[PDB]
Amino acid sequence: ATQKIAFSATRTINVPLRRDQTIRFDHVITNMNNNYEPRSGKFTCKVPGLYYFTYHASSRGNLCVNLMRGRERAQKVVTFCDYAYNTFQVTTGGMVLKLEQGENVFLQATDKNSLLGMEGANSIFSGFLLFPD
Amino acid sequence: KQKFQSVFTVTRQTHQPPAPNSLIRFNAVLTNPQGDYDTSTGKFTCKVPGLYYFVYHASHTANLCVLLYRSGVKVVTFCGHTSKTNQVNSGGVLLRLQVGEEVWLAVNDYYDMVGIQGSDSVFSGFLLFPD
Amino acid sequence: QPRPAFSAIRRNPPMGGNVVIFDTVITNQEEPYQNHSGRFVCTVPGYYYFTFQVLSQWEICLSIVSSSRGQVRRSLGFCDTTNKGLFQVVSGGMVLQLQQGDQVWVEKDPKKGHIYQGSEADSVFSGFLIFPS
Ligand SMILES: CC(=O)N[C@@H]1[C@@H](O)[C@H](O)[C@@H](CO)O[C@H]1O
Numbered sequence: 001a002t003q004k005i006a007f008s009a010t011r012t013i014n015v016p017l018r019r020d021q022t023i024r025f026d027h028v029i030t031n032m033n034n035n036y037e038p039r040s041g042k043f044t045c046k047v048p049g050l051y052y053f054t055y056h057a058s059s060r061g062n063l064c065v066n067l068m069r070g071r072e073r074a075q076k077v078v079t080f081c082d083y084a085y086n087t088f089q090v091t092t093g094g095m096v097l098k099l100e101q102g103e104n105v106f107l108q109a110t111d112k113n114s115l116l117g118m119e120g121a122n123s124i125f126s127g128f129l130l131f132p133d
Numbered sequence: 134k135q136k137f138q139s140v141f142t143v144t145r146q147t148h149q150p151p152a153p154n155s156l157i158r159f160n161a162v163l164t165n166p167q168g169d170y171d172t173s174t175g176k177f178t179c180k181v182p183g184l185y186y187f188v189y190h191a192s193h194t195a196n197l198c199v200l201l202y203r204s205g206v207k208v209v210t211f212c213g214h215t216s217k218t219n220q221v222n223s224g225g226v227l228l229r230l231q232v233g234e235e236v237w238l239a240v241n242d243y244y245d246m247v248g249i250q251g252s253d254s255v256f257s258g259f260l261l262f263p264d
Numbered sequence: 265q266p267r268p269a270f271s272a273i274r275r276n277p278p279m280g281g282n283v284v285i286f287d288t289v290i291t292n293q294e295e296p297y298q299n300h301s302g303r304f305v306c307t308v309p310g311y312y313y314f315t316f317q318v319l320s321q322w323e324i325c326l327s328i329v330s331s332s333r334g335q336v337r338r339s340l341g342f343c344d345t346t347n348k349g350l351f352q353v354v355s356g357g358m359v360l361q362l363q364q365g366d367q368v369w370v371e372k373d374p375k376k377g378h379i380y381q382g383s384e385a386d387s388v389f390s391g392f393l394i395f396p397s
């Protein structure tokens with residue numbers, strides 16, 4: 001319409017995540033309005049309103065991720081866990097959030113850090129504006 | 134006005150899975166008012182230019198990789214491995230499309246889409262921001 | 265201007281019946297979602313997206329069900345039958361064209377209805393208007 005805010009970014013880094021680390025999705029497929037930062041992996045709200053956030057992550061073992069929301073200090077909205085013994089999986093999560101300007105949203109690793117990002121088994125993080133405030 | 138929007142949800146209603154390394158046809162429509170998804174070719178074609186969301190959820194009881202294609206280029210791949218029990222393979226992406234661009238899903242050598250009773254396969258796409 | 269958008273999660277759900285109640289509201293713009301019943305009520309007629317990511321450890325089959333004039337309209341299902349006692353996330357979603365008063369909810373298979381209950385991880389139900397009709 002007018003306020004066109006949408007991002008989709010894949011992860012291509014094969015370096016193991018540590019607990020509490022921000023999960024970076026370094027390769028942008030889409031980033032309209034450039035409110036997503038591929039250097040950190042965080043989205044930062046410019047225009048207040050309703051957003052939908054979603055991810056799909058490939059993994060070869062146990063994976064838990066925290067969906068984080070906040071300004072300079074972030075709080076976890078939810079934790080998604082999907083386990084896999086010795087087998088490849090793709091898991092997913094989504095969330096509708098009403099965000100204020102300055103609020104950031106990003107995914108954060110736990111203990112459970114088995115996540116792949118590569119050709120043939122991607123991991124992706126997306127979000128878009130539903131309705132402006 | 135209906136023709137200034139774009140939305141579909143199609144499903145795969147058949148017990149036989151796709152052929153290896155082929156485009157995945159969804160033959161049944163839940164909604165497709167603009168006809169942007171074509172059940173005879175298996176392809177979405179862009180009528181209204183702008184930003185789209187595409188997402189799918191595919192049931193399988195053997196190995197399955199789903200590839201999403203845009204105008205001949207593979208955008209994303211997601212794979213799920215299982216043996217005789219049922220899981221859902223999911224994937225999705227936002228894309229800014231021009232009129233006439235085609236979007237579709239395909240499989241590779243891991244092609245199973247045979248869900249147990251009560252587990253189906255769906256592919257959705259909708260226009261968020263027109264230009 | 266029409267905004268209807270919700271996300272709800274499970275934490276202290278009333279149990280009973282095959283309707284999956286997500287008792288904890290994260291977002292409820294226009295308050296379309298009823299957290300005591302697990303039912304979304306359409307106020308603005310139009311095309312809506314609905315999706316769920318639900319955690320199980322055993323067997324689970326879920327369906328997004330709707331109703332018009334109180335008549336139930338069954339739809340597609342989605343299952344995880346890994347049945348090994350480890351976190352698996354079953355997911356599904358669809359566009360639904362709704363009329364005013366139409367209700368939308370998640371229902372489980374009475375024979376396959378294990379939904380994780382606890383604080384390690386979350387199950388989510390979300391929905392939003394795509395465009396009014
Ligand atoms: C368990 C239940 O359904 N009731 C809760 C109630 O405790 C809470 O005060 C209210 C506020 O949103 O949300 C309801 O869902």
Ligand SMILES: [Ca+2]
Pocket residue numbers: 082083084089351352353
């Ligand atoms: Ca799993």
